[PDB]
Amino acid sequence: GSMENFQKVEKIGEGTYGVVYKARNKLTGEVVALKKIRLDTEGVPSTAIREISLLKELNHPNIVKLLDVIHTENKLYLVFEFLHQDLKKFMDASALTGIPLPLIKSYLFQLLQGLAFCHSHRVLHRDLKPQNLLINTEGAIKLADFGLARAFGVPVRTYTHEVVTLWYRAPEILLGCKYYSTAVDIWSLGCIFAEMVTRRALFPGDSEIDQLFRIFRTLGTPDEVVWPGVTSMPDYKPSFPKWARQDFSKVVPPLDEDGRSLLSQMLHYDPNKRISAKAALAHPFFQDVTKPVPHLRL
Amino acid sequence: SVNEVPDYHEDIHTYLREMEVKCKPKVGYMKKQPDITNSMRAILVDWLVEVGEEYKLQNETLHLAVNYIDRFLSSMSVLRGKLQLVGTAAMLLASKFEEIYPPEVAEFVYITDDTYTKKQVLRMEHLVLKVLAFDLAAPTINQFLTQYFLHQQPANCKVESLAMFLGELSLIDADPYLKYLPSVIAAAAFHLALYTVTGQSWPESLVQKTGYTLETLKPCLLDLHQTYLRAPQHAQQSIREKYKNSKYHGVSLLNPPETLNV
Numbered sequence: 001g002s003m004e005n006f007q008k009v010e011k012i013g014e015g016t017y018g019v020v021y022k023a024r025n026k027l028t029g030e031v032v033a034l035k036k037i038r039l040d041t042e043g044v045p046s047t048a049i050r051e052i053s054l055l056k057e058l059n060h061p062n063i064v065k066l067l068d069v070i071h072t073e074n075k076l077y078l079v080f081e082f083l084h085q086d087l088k089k090f091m092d093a094s095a096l097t098g099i100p101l102p103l104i105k106s107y108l109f110q111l112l113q114g115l116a117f118c119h120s121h122r123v124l125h126r127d128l129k130p131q132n133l134l135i136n137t138e139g140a141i142k143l144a145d146f147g148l149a150r151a152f153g154v155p156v157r158t159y160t161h162e163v164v165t166l167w168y169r170a171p172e173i174l175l176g177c178k179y180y181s182t183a184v185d186i187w188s189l190g191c192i193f194a195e196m197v198t199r200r201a202l203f204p205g206d207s208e209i210d211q212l213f214r215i216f217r218t219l220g221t222p223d224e225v226v227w228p229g230v231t232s233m234p235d236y237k238p239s240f241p242k243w244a245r246q247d248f249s250k251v252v253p254p255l256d257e258d259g260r261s262l263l264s265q266m267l268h269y270d271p272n273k274r275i276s277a278k279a280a281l282a283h284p285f286f287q288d289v290t291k292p293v294p295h296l297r298l
Numbered sequence: 299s300v301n302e303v304p305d306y307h308e309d310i311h312t313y314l315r316e317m318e319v320k321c322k323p324k325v326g327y328m329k330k331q332p333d334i335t336n337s338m339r340a341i342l343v344d345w346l347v348e349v350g351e352e353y354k355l356q357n358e359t360l361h362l363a364v365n366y367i368d369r370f371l372s373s374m375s376v377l378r379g380k381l382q383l384v385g386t387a388a389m390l391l392a393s394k395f396e397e398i399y400p401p402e403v404a405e406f407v408y409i410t411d412d413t414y415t416k417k418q419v420l421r422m423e424h425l426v427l428k429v430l431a432f433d434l435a436a437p438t439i440n441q442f443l444t445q446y447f448l449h450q451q452p453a454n455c456k457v458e459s460l461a462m463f464l465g466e467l468s469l470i471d472a473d474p475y476l477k478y479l480p481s482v483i484a485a486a487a488f489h490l491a492l493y494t495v496t497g498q499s500w501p502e503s504l505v506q507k508t509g510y511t512l513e514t515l516k517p518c519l520l521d522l523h524q525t526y527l528r529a530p531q532h533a534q535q536s537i538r539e540k541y542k543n544s545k546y547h548g549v550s551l552l553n554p555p556e557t558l559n560v
């Protein structure tokens with residue numbers, strides 16, 4: 001590519017280092033999303049460098065496809081396959097119906113597939129929230145926005161502490177652990193699972209401490225029994241209130257036994273015991289999974 | 299534990315083994331460079347080691363930069379006065395990919411002793427990205443080493459730091475190390491470090507993981523052993539100085555073995 005072959009249709013989003021347009025290839029008909037990255041005095045943003053290099057390798061049905069990079073002096077365009085909306089807007093549009101269980105189950109299964117593929121290719125996503133999960137009219141859901149992602153090594157080193165939009169942020173990040181790993185993305189997807197079922201955020205804190213306490217009030221304040229080493233973590237305080245763990249059927253009341261089992265394994269405190277995306281695919285919850293079209297017009 | 303990604307380790311290793319072949323520089327490129335030599339490249343890589351020390355960069359970042367340089371020079375003829383510009387843009391790109399806090403671009407201009415302007419560095423950054431097609435997530439010696447380390451019984455810091463030191467020495471000398479893949483240099487570096495420090499050998503568990511044996515590693519090991527023996531005399535000395543530091547357990551002060559008995 002390109003550029004002269006693209007016909008911009010409308011602005012669809014924004015945008016730290018730029019803007020996203022819906023556009024169409026005038027010659028092939030292909031509808032695309034064009035992510036414009038503004039250039040310059042530090043040169044190409046490290047977020048753009050990571051998003052592009054990491055997505056070059058990640059070809060999977062549940063990861064948004066980077067089609068091309070249009071690379072010039074003052075502009076950088078990332079050309080992506082077009083997806084019709086994000087999960088957040090889908091949840092809002094499903095306000096009164098709710099999302100049918102077969103769709104929630106289909107979407108979780110696809111997200112786990114997409115994530116396991118990332119992790120098998122040494123990529124942490126590190127910002128899984130419904131806004132970064134895009135859906136099409138054929139029933140696909142895909143991981144998007146890898147600006148915050150990281151290629152990791154085995155075993156992991158210390159990476160950026162900022163990490164993950166607060167509501168979806170794992171307790172080991174909040175407690176300042178020197179290391180975090182693939183488990184952080186599973187924690188996020190567990191929050192998303194609950195959210196698809198309720199259509200409201202599981203842990204909507206307004207600060208790190210508020211976030212932690214909201215988690216503790218739902219899952220119990222973790223001790224050495226539930227999470228070996230927890231009390232030695234940098235930002236753990238002996239003064240933390242010790243909340244009792246809720247009956248888990250009370251966390252997401254409309255969820256069936258298999259659903260609650262999987263959710264509980266995704267929200268395990270101990271990152272070492274938390275379920276992996278790969279193992280989760282084989283969970284009894286998915287025994288009857290299908291891939292239906294969304295019930296609403298997109 | 300999860301930090302060692304038990305559920306993905308094997309997939310990752312397999313993936314890296316595929317990518318290293320794809321990301322491999324051309325073995326014979328220096329022959330096709332009219333104006334630059336292995337020796338000039340050695341000066342460059344040794345300078346990059348100093349830069350990484352000055353700015354306290356990850357060793358990973360240094361490995362990446364060298365991969366980017368060697369790949370760039372596999373297709374682009376470069377005059378001697380522009381070699382350091384390629385090197386500097388490569389280290390900038392590697393830092394942005396790999397560092398939590400990469401040095402500012404001005405910091406990169408500063409360490410070139412103002413040979414180049416900020417505009418040149420930034421234009422070279424763009425050019426390197428174009429030539430490499432943004433394919434920056436390359437496997438390094440270090441990415442294999444840290445996986446191999448998990449097979450020690452038990453873990454030994456001198457073994458780890460020494461293996462790293464040896465892998466780092468290989469970055470300096472395109473002849474012969476351009477011949478060998480990162481996974482193979484890491485394997486020879488790990489065996490040689492294990493042998494120097496503990497008298498042990500490349501373990502069976504790593505034959506199982508990698509399919510490499512002492513016989514398949516022999517050529518690289520013979521090269522690396524000689525490099526280790528000759529290291530005090532090499533014209534480039536920044537890695538040796540670097541590895542005297544307590545940070546790396548002073549491993550460059552250890553004496554190489556006189557024979558490998560392989």
Ligand SMILES: Nc1nccc(-c2c3c(O)ccnc3n3c(N)nccc23)n1
Nearest residue numbers: 012013014020033080081082083144145
């Ligand atoms: N509205 C909005 N805001 C930010 C990003 C995006 C976005 C995106 C993005 O940020 C990264 C990759 N793909 C994206 N994408 C696709 N493929 N289709 C439609 C939208 C979209 N869309």
Ligand SMILES: [Mg+2]
Nearest residue numbers: 328331334335
């Ligand atoms: Mg030459």
